[PDB]
Ligand binder design. Structure first.
Ligand code: NAP
Ligand code: NAP
Lengths: 180, 181
């Protein structure tokens, strides 16, 4: 507790499932929480975006890059928080954009600290994937405290965090193939 | 609806998700509904086994073969209902048992009618939703009304039911490989 997630799709919902199964309290921010809540694990509290971001210290940004700027109205609430960029760009997106999605996200929310994590993990692995601790997540970011928070979370969820350095490493991390 | 599901695992949970996304009301029977409910889609009503099987006309049996007989105490409530055997046996289990899982389940609950369906569909395919051409669900069973009920459900979920005949076809259906991506 309390971990935030912005977004309502397959990845959001799988993250929520894993977090709840790992003893975290979870709040989800959706544009249509009424509709979205129906499919989410009951233990997660699905609410409006504004209200979902205010409590948590760590917020997973489980939306596509093209929708990042739509979150700008949440800036005053998000101030000083940890944002997790989970995006797994296609080969073409990766090559088209000079900066990583994670760096782009950092630029949009300069008062937040961004950690890149979970891009190489499938939604089904999140849902089902055995809590053997064998499955590696690469993790980077500029802030050691933020990286530790996300790494401990990864461990509690049964993954094995691998430190890949500063947020400048996010471009190479975003090139890593999704497993599997 | 309401559609029933017995069991609390990855498959139960995925079936539930999918059913609720397709406009069905869903009730789930678990031995520990307090714990189990936490992970299930909010729109599903997770409750005790006895209470779960009491309302619905069609009940998905999303537990392993080895646990089928543990459901015998529910016999009185399950009488006259449609049971869906979704099991995907391992090659070994398939070869060790003379009869199919579905036929075994039919023998345990003779006042019920069993339909074999969904064994070839992965839990993730249930969750994420089918997409072409990964839509095909083999169905068999002895009773045309029961097969129609399950087939319409399949169609509502976005699958394409394929009639494989009587419950005697279930052994061959159970040999069908499970499909992923
Ligand atoms: N699925 C995987 O196996 C996988 C693996 C690794 C990483 N990821 C990453 O997770 C992120 C989301 O993926 P997904 O598979 O969950 O996609 P998805 O199913 O399409 O979900 C996208 C979500 O974006 C949210 N969103 C917020 N603002 C939006 C807007 N303005 N327009 C459209 N949508 C908006 C939506 O929630 P609301 O409408 O309720 O706000 C929606 O649920 C992506 O960056 C992806 O690379 C996915
Ligand atoms: N997962 C897939 O991709 C896949 C695909 C097709 C078919 N299936 C089929 O779906 C069925 C279940 O699969 P699953 O992946 O959901 O397995 P699972 O995660 O192990 O779930 C089995 C469930 O059986 C229930 N159960 C009822 N009585 C039990 C007992 N006495 N002892 C132990 N468990 C008992 C449990 O729920 P409660 O504790 O609440 O009772 C448990 O959650 C299997 O026959 C499988 O072949 C799975």
């Amino acid at each position: 507790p309390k971990v935030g997630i912005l977004g309502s799709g397959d990845f959001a919902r799988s993250l929520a499932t894993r977090l709840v199964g790992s003893g975290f309290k979870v709040v989800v921010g959706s544009r249509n929480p009424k509709r979205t809540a129906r499919l989410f694990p009951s233990a997660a509290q699905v609410t409006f975006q504004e209200e979902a971001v205010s409590s948590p210290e760590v917020i997973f940004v489980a939306v596509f890059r093209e929708h990042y700027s739509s979150l700008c109205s949440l800036s005053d609430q998000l101030a000083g928080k940890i944002l997790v960029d989970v995006s797994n760009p296609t080969e073409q997106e990766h090559l088209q954009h000079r900066e990583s999605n994670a760096e782009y996200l950092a630029s949009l929310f300069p008062t937040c600290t961004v950690v890149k994590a979970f891009n190489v993990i499938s939604a089904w692995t999140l849902q089902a994937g055995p809590r053997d601790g064998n499955r590696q997540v690469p993790i980077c970011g500029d802030q050691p405290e933020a990286k530790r928070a996300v790494s401990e979370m990864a461990l509690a969820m049964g993954f094995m965090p691998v430190d890949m350095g500063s947020l400048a490493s996010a471009w190479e991390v975003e090139a890593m193939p999704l497993r599997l």
